Amino acid sequence: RSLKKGPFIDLHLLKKVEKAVESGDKKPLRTWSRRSTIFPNMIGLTIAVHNGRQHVPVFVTDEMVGHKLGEFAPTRTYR
Amino acid sequence: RIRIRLKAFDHRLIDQATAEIVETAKRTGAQVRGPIPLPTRKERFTVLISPHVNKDARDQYEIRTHLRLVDIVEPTEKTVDALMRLDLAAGVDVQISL
Amino acid sequence: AKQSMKAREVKRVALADKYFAKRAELKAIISDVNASDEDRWNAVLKLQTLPRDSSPSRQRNRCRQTGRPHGFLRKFGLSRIKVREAAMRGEIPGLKKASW
Amino acid sequence: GQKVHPNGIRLGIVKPWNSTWFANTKEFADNLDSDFKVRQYLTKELAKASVSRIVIERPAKSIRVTIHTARPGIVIGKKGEDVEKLRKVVADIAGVPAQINIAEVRKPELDAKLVADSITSQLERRVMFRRAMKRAVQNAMRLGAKGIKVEVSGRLGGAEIARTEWYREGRVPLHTLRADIDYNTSEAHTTYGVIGVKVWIFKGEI
Amino acid sequence: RRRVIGQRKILPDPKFGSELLAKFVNILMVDGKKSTAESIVYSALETLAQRSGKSELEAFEVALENVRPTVEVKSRRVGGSTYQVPVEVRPVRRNALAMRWIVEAARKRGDKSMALRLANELSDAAENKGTAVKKREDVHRMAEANKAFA
RNA sequence: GCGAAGAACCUUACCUGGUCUUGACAUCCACGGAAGUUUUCAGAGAUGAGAAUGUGCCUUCGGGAACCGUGAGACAGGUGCUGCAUGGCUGUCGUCAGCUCGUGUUGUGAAAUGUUGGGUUAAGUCCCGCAACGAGCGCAACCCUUAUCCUUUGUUGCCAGCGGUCCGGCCGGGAACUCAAAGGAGACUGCCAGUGAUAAACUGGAGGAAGGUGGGGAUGACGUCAAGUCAUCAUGGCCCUUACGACCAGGGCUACACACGUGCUACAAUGGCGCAUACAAAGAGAAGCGACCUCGCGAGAGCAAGCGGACCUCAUAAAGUGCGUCGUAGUCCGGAUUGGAGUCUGCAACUCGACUCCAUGAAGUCGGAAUCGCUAGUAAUCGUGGAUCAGAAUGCCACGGUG
RNA sequence: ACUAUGGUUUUUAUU
């Protein structure tokens, strides 16, 4: 079973939160996929994920209870 | 000790091959007179009659696989050459072993 | 049989030599993520996911006259209907119907 | 009728076969890829040896072949007991050393393949063809046989009309199991139209 | 339209010598297993001892004579015409129908083992007070609708 | 459970955005580099940009070429649209007894005769009758296969008869009985008695292991209809080709407002549970099956004998036989929920993975209307193999026990 | 022991 239990990090996010102090202030970065889990280091960086035709803006806060990036991005256009 | 592998898909062709290697053994001195036939095997296969949308209806085809090993107690100056140069028969697989 | 799937089948043989040979001993030691819980070789862990198409996944042996995964006998490479053609020509060895 | 094939669906009984090849049971599926590699340069050499029938013979990791010809002087000259001039070609096109054999022919005009070649010569040339059909019927029925079908389809005009015709002689059982019907397929396109020639000969049962 | 039989060989009981006492087992059995039916026959005779059991040295051959199927209706024509008339069931069938009529009543008693249920229904059939008869009462009415036939 | 034996990516049609192109696939021309290996940064990747090392094949070094990287034309790619174009293969009746021919005969002719008519059959099968007659293809034959009695063999298979006996087919030793690979004999309506133009052709009885084509397979005439399919494949017309093409990463054929065949399991005590206990076929395996022995509640893991597959491996088949025990309690039987952790595999177990261990226990008393299978080793019924397979069935195909 | 429907147009002989 899973790794390592619970939500585990991805290099494609771990880099973008380390570059957040090198690239500074900017409009949201695209990451495409919705599979990754959130972690407490995602704070202060805005990102965007693919909805099936475009991208939608997402931000992480301490008010979260652990999630996948799809829990910020609905892909369906009825109900 | 050495063994000569004879494999065939028919119960009469393996005995024709046994008579062909005994006829050659009698013509290289002495080496084979009447070997053991071993246990047998079968494989059954099905084919389709219509190329599309009927696989319930089939027809059956069969092979009867035989194996003989001959087994030799002492090879000669003619066993290792003249019996190896033998072309035998078509439809049968011949190999030397060990 | 699709020329892009025939060309991929050749690329797979040449990449099984590259990403699926002499890497299994390393894969046995890098795949552990509980024994210390410490991260120190992430680039080598992401090397086990480098092969995407050349490993035993996707690879199927298929019918060798159509590329199709269906209705064939791997002991001859022929379909359940081209075996009738070849058996009617004596072109599959010893395979017969009656005449015994 | 008309799709029951004498050298197809009816070939698995009482008839001599034109190909036999031996291989490891675990690699027959791999050696299947070679069955065209042995033909691709040899098929266009058969008429250049006047061959009426070929028998492809292929021992494990080897090749032999036997060819049947009425005119071996076209490809070997005199006296016929040295086949070197053909063996050196067959071994080179196959990429492996070979030992080929040459066989004789009896009643060569009593053959569906010669009748088919004698009729195709008229239609690939867009000339008068019925003379060759009647000549083939009165050749075969007076050389042996008890009935014959010679059939033509396409470019039978009359300018740009297609049509199909045969005009049968004697009797020819095409649905009887063990009838031993001698047959050949012919199909061609002139780049201006499609043509086809179909031939069946009956000689005797079993 | 062609058969004509062919009655097929059957093995009579080894201890009582009877064909009818082997025929009972072929109807008492479940899922073709037959071996548990071979353990219920005669075991149901020791329980029947305390009750109205008929001829104990004939086991069930005389107690089956207290079960009375007699007539059959529906699925019939006479004179080429559709008719609701009853017919009398063949004597070789009447007892094989009586076998189903008793084991289908006995197994559906709400109490004890089959060896007791069957001994109750064979004692109660010998006074005509048995269970599971209302299921066939509308057929017995249809058999009494006509006495003049065609 | 059908095109399509196991659709997470892939597959793929559909759908979004990257990345690459006269094309990875077939051949030909201008120009360069050995393919390859080693490594850094950009990108999740297809790919993009740098930095080294090799100098093969071919080769008097000439430039060629497998292959790699840029150019250009003829042409390539496309499960793209369409089975009212053109092949190929095609559904079902059905092994059904039918479809036809030549020369005469007959009518104004299309058409008829024969092949209809009368008995008989599985039958256009055979007799009868005959201005129509004999023939062709289908049929029947032919071919495969089974119980019995023989026969070849004689093994690691079998043990009647005879010798010995760890008192055993075990060992002597034997080809009896099974048997393995195969070949024969038996059956002729012969015999009794009936049926019937006492014909043709059928039906009981006796004997026999089995009898009235002994049975059952395997044999596919004429064909039926604008027969099915641009989705196996071929391919015109028409379209896309800086792509609707191949390649990557996302997804869609389980989103749920409305919903259904086909098939299966319990409804008992002829059970539910813990033990005792009896009998298998079909097969299957070297980057294979994997043992011995320990560990893991278990799925599995450590590990690596033997066998190239009748003295090795998969693999103690379950229904059935008999004790103990609960009890007519919507059931101490039965099955939807429910909450997590283990084992195996894989870009990946978000999501509709499989295998494995629990607790809760709604529904269920053979089910309205309509309606299916089978004449006997048949119907019914409980288990076990084989194939697919990176990980994934009770389905597909087989086989045995009871009947 | 019981009943009426169907417009108009409408594809094989060959690549």
Side-chain angles (χ1 to χ4, degrees):
Chain A
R1 291 292 193 118
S2 308
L3 294 100
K4 191 76 198 302
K5 290 183 177 184
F8 187 65
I9 56 172
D10 209 308
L11 184 67
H12 76 65
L13 300 183
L14 189 68
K15 288 172 60 171
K16 296 182 178 67
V17 303
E18 197 166 271
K19 297 287 159 186
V21 298
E22 296 179 33
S23 64
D25 194 53
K26 58 192 183 293
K27 283 183 168 75
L29 294 180
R30 288 176 174 169
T31 72
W32 303 259
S33 293
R34 295 177 302 266
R35 261 278 181 175
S36 301
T37 46
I38 66 170
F39 56 107
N41 199 17
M42 296 186 73
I43 54 179
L45 176 63
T46 49
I47 62 172
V49 292
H50 182 55
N51 84 342
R53 292 198 288 173
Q54 300 190 11
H55 291 247
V56 293
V58 177
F59 72 106
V60 182
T61 64
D62 183 74
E63 302 97 85
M64 295 290 149
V65 294
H67 297 294
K68 303 186 185 69
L69 290 177
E71 298 172 57
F72 302 81
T75 59
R76 307 309 183 90
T77 331
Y78 57 69
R79 303 188 170 216
Chain B
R1 294 183 178 269
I2 63 177
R3 277 170 285 284
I4 302 176
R5 308 180 63 80
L6 299 175
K7 296 178 70 173
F9 303 102
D10 173 70
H11 77 274
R12 304 189 188 81
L13 187 61
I14 192 68
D15 222 62
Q16 284 175 347
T18 304
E20 187 74 272
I21 198 169
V22 170
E23 185 164 278
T24 315
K26 288 172 182 178
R27 291 172 176 185
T28 54
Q31 201 55 257
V32 195
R33 305 187 302 175
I36 60 174
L38 308 183
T40 337
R41 280 177 172 243
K42 292 181 186 179
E43 291 177 93
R44 299 288 292 210
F45 298 96
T46 49
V47 297
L48 303 191
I49 301 172
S50 280
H52 188 231
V53 290
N54 188 354
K55 58 185 174 182
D56 168 59
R58 311 203 191 170
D59 187 25
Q60 294 167 359
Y61 287 70
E62 180 188 80
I63 57 179
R64 302 186 200 157
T65 46
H66 283 257
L67 176 67
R68 297 184 187 183
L69 300 176
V70 181
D71 199 36
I72 283 170
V73 184
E74 192 200 322
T76 70
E77 71 194 335
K78 291 179 174 170
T79 308
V80 303
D81 181 84
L83 201 67
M84 307 304 185
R85 287 157 63 194
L86 178 58
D87 203 52
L88 196 85
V92 183
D93 188 70
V94 188
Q95 300 178 31
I96 185 56
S97 65
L98 81 140
Chain C
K2 197 181 178 185
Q3 286 281 23
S4 59
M5 294 173 64
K6 287 164 52 173
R8 188 177 290 269
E9 192 181 83
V10 176
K11 186 174 172 180
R12 283 176 178 153
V13 177
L15 288 180
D17 172 67
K18 191 169 180 161
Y19 308 138
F20 210 68
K22 305 195 184 109
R23 292 190 182 206
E25 293 180 295
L26 180 66
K27 195 173 183 299
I29 65 171
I30 301 296
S31 57
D32 203 313
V33 294
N34 301 277
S36 72
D37 192 53
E38 195 174 288
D39 173 48
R40 73 279 192 211
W41 54 39
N42 180 262
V44 196
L45 180 64
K46 294 179 65 66
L47 204 76
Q48 315 311 310
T49 43
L50 176 64
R52 277 285 295 127
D53 190 62
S54 55
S55 300
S57 305
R58 306 175 179 185
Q59 183 74 254
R60 294 187 78 180
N61 81 103
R62 294 161 175 275
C63 186
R64 311 307 302 187
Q65 287 192 346
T66 57
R68 216 168 192 86
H70 309 95
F72 79 92
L73 289 168
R74 78 196 297 145
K75 292 175 188 181
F76 311 113
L78 291 169
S79 74
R80 67 191 173 203
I81 58 172
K82 295 286 171 182
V83 169
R84 195 182 77 175
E85 292 190 20
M88 287 174 170
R89 298 198 316 270
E91 283 173 45
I92 296 167
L95 185 67
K96 73 197 294 171
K97 168 173 175 179
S99 309
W100 55 51
Chain D
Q2 64 168 350
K3 299 296 186 63
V4 59
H5 196 316
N7 291 0
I9 203 172
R10 285 283 177 76
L11 188 52
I13 43 162
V14 307
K15 282 183 173 191
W17 294 309
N18 293 7
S19 184
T20 169
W21 62 269
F22 306 122
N24 177 0
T25 51
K26 309 187 182 195
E27 295 201 325
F28 186 99
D30 179 65
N31 282 265
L32 181 62
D33 185 77
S34 314
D35 180 66
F36 184 64
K37 297 185 167 59
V38 299
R39 280 191 182 83
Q40 62 180 352
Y41 306 126
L42 181 62
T43 48
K44 74 186 196 175
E45 300 288 315
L46 305 180
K48 201 161 67 201
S50 309
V51 173
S52 45
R53 201 173 73 95
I54 180 161
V55 184
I56 297 176
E57 299 175 280
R58 287 169 58 214
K61 213 81 184 304
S62 193
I63 189 163
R64 288 179 174 170
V65 189
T66 298
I67 51 161
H68 289 238
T69 180
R71 307 185 171 190
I74 201 177
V75 64
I76 226 73
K78 293 189 190 297
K79 62 194 282 177
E81 62 163 75
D82 181 31
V83 303
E84 187 183 306
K85 291 176 294 191
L86 180 61
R87 178 172 55 247
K88 71 188 184 188
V89 172
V90 174
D92 192 79
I93 66 179
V96 287
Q99 292 296 343
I100 189 161
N101 195 255
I102 320 181
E104 72 200 297
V105 182
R106 302 167 190 77
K107 302 197 188 189
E109 286 175 79
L110 197 66
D111 197 292
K113 212 172 289 163
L114 187 146
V115 169
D117 185 65
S118 305
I119 295 164
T120 296
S121 284
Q122 311 297 114
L123 291 174
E124 76 179 34
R125 206 180 302 146
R126 208 184 182 174
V127 301
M128 195 288 192
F129 55 87
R130 290 163 189 117
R131 190 180 178 183
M133 297 178 72
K134 281 180 165 177
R135 281 176 61 76
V137 173
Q138 298 299 332
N139 184 354
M141 292 295 295
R142 300 182 183 268
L143 178 59
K146 296 186 184 290
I148 182 166
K149 267 281 291 292
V150 284
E151 184 179 302
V152 293
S153 298
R155 308 295 277 172
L156 312 182
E160 305 301 296
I161 68 183
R163 291 173 67 159
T164 181
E165 58 177 78
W166 55 98
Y167 299 85
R168 202 175 73 179
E169 183 64 286
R171 291 186 179 140
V172 185
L174 298 183
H175 285 281
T176 312
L177 186 69
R178 306 182 299 196
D180 178 46
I181 306 296
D182 183 16
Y183 177 91
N184 174 83
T185 322
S186 307
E187 194 172 274
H189 196 318
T190 62
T191 79
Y192 301 97
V194 290
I195 60 170
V197 188
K198 226 74 149 285
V199 184
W200 307 248
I201 309 177
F202 176 62
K203 296 192 302 292
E205 287 163 30
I206 202 52
Chain E
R1 304 188 191 85
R2 293 175 72 197
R3 298 197 190 183
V4 198
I5 67 175
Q7 295 83 355
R8 306 199 206 91
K9 288 173 177 179
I10 186 165
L11 189 71
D13 185 283
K15 286 162 60 176
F16 288 77
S18 167
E19 194 181 308
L20 189 71
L21 294 174
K23 199 69 170 173
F24 199 106
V25 192
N26 289 359
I27 305 179
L28 184 65
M29 66 165 170
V30 180
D31 296 309
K33 298 169 166 182
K34 204 179 290 193
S35 293
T36 317
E38 292 179 305
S39 305
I40 293 163
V41 295
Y42 318 107
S43 307
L45 194 66
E46 306 194 319
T47 46
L48 185 57
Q50 307 183 20
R51 307 183 180 226
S52 308
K54 310 305 182 180
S55 212
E56 189 169 278
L57 83 183
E58 300 180 76
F60 312 120
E61 300 182 287
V62 175
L64 190 62
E65 202 60 41
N66 288 96
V67 185
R68 192 54 54 189
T70 49
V71 293
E72 174 162 74
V73 291
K74 306 167 191 174
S75 294
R76 201 154 290 270
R77 295 179 82 95
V78 182
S81 310
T82 315
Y83 265 105
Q84 293 187 355
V85 299
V87 289
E88 303 186 87
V89 295
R90 280 185 171 176
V92 290
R93 177 184 169 208
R94 189 174 65 236
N95 56 19
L97 181 59
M99 286 172 182
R100 178 62 72 191
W101 279 24
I102 197 69
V103 305
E104 193 172 67
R107 201 187 170 186
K108 297 188 172 286
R109 300 309 311 265
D111 200 45
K112 307 296 188 286
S113 54
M114 188 61 169
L116 193 283
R117 298 179 191 181
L118 184 61
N120 186 90
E121 293 307 293
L122 287 172
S123 298
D124 292 12
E127 61 181 85
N128 209 358
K129 307 299 180 185
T131 62
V133 308
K134 291 287 186 181
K135 63 176 177 186
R136 62 175 188 239
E137 191 175 73
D138 206 67
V139 151
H140 201 74
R141 279 194 291 271
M142 187 178 187
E144 232 177 289
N146 191 343
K147 58 169 62 179
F149 303 87

